[PDB]
Ligand binder design. Sequence first.
Ligand code: ZN
Ligand code: ZN
Ligand code: ZN
Ligand code: ZN
Ligand code: ZN
Ligand code: ZN
Lengths: 431, 431
Amino acid sequence: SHMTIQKVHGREVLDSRGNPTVEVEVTTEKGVFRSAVPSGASTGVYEACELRDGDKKRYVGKGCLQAVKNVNEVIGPALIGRDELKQEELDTLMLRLDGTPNKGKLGANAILGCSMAISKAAAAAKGVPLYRYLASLAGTKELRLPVPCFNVINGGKHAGNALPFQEFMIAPVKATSFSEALRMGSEVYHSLRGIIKKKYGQDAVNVGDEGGFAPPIKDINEPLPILMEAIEEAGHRGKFAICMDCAASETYDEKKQQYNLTFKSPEPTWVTAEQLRETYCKWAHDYPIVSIEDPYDQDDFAGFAGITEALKGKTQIVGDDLTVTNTERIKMAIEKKACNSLLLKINQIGTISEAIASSKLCMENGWSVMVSHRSGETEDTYIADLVVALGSGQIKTGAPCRGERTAKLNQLLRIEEELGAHAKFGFPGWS
Amino acid sequence: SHMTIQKVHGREVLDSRGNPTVEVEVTTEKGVFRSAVPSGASTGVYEACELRDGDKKRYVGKGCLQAVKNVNEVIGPALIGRDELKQEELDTLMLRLDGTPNKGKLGANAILGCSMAISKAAAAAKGVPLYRYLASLAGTKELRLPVPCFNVINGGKHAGNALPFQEFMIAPVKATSFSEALRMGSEVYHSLRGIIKKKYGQDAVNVGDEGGFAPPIKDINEPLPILMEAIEEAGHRGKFAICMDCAASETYDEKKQQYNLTFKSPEPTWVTAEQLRETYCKWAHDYPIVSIEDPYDQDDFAGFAGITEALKGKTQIVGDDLTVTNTERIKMAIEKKACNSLLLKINQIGTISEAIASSKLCMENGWSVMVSHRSGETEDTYIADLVVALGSGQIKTGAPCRGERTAKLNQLLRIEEELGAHAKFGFPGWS
Ligand SMILES: [Zn+2]
Ligand SMILES: [Zn+2]
Ligand SMILES: [Zn+2]
Ligand SMILES: [Zn+2]
Ligand SMILES: [Zn+2]
Ligand SMILES: [Zn+2]
């Protein structure tokens, strides 16, 4: 009938690293609703299946023709004529079409694009913006613009440097609006570039996958003074906090049960989890570090729990690979008091309904939720709407550099403008 | 009346370097049509005015509040109730509102966003995609997907390296479709990363503003073998050509009348224009270099004309800073036979009507036209539609990396898909 889904079409497009990913368009009488799927590099072993073709003759095996075929030939034909308003029903249909816990049959990258585009078609059907529609789905009482955590010095897996830990971020927590937050973040970012150029030279100011600088730094402590210097120089002393994403699993050796802090270097530097805790306690004390994500390997619940307790009320501990936006893993984390913040990645789980369920479970258990991009992004801006819709007050979506990051930041500007001067900003705990 | 412009609104958003730029939304009954303005770094002295606030307390003077105010308070109120179909009429109105040759009163960055969004509103009014609408405005007989020229080794102004010349590009000229072109470009890009990492080390594979690698190379000849190596390694021997953007004005000293090939280094390396011609003749002979842009300073018509004649039929010479997408400068270039290719930058001139006039003048005089991004881009994809609409067969819009580049490439995928299997691809001269 007239208001239902008319067409569903997937296509392979490129992500911000030039790798294929999936985009889906759901067409209704209200228009064409397009959603693209991001792709991680430091993907947790428990993430929902990202289905790649493995054809060495295309994109050296990273094609998404099969996931796209799954959208075009399996999921889409199922959705035609369906009521896009029925988000849970359609997500559940898609889960059942796949029939596997990890979305390994159809691919989470086939499913998620559908889930996303359905929600956008549904928002259009309701005649509200996506963030309003998602807030209704989530039962969110109060929308808010999030404080952005800007990953401004890039390290880890496939950043061009020795730096083993992945993200050194700045967050304008004392900004009083998103507009002001974004400008401050950009201003610090610009100061930071001059600071890095002066200290490490010209060659040090090219950018990593998420638009942070990729200076030739090996030691994980070295970026922090630089961050404080840039904050100061930009004129924003006292306005900012620091967030870390260690992505510690990427450095972890399971057999040795130790972390290699020079895993991108010829010689290894094996450090224990107890040595890491010392480092994190020192970090939290020496700097305004309000968030540490994946400080330990993804199955080290005990390490996570120890640092969560140690930095309780000072520094939230964010599960990313630990939790993989998955209520099963989240329940394990709650049971162990392993962390108190969810990094919410729609493509870690693969449907909007499930991502929303994860956010609600975390918040009911008193965690914060930081909606997140992946290191492989697109021009898609869904997470801008999603973070506002969840009212979580926290987003990480890149340095204020590179279009696949600024697209989200800009969308947040647009949402902020729509919500007007009484719209809440930031994370109350950090304000 | 019902079909006319209802609302015009500008806002400051961030570009891909995290600097403010202008975005404009024109609202009609058909929806909200949003266009953002790009920003150059190596801006020709003859470019239309990019109006910045100069307030050191915001974005260290790079705010676009004044241009946004100009949209909101001057241009927009003039457009309300106007027929968006009347592109020339509305562009001309905007030219007259400004009243200055260089758009120095309102700013080309205020005007262009309006010009763009009007054309999108008008396409929606006609019920055709933007590229079809623009093709009608341009009188284009045959749409075509362009061969993309991918700037994969980044140098020049504010790239983090000694490399003085700005763009070393690869173009999959022998691809038979845009899909195939894009994949090839990406594949070579990926091979290139491994090649650069092996040769220059880990720290060499971070990216420049346009998503090319920014390796620690000083000498302008050094990137070329690397390009050929990556083409070969990716499996695409013989399929590619090379395009250069020297941006030679950025290295040029007016008093010395020589080019500084180490202008980002402590010591200068002064080279004459005649030494440059030797280099370009050698380039064109040693490599499949089919295009050289801005080989000389922006007012060196004689240097341009000499190299144009020397590489006639082998290597097109592209005016960028020379011509600044401006029929006045273009007429000077035609008179001097200074070049035979227009780099078309909508924001060099500031209206769609004028940009189209420039394309038509160049093509009537037998030049090719390469539609171009700026080094400061946004998630805007107008140039994807524009290049197809002009049927010029050539676009440069970045390495296949960074969302503000891949957004255009992806849009080209979408357009290609809409046009189907009989859609023409590439630049006939290069095929
Ligand atoms: Zn209807
Ligand atoms: Zn990761
Ligand atoms: Zn993470
Ligand atoms: Zn009407
Ligand atoms: Zn330039
Ligand atoms: Zn140029």
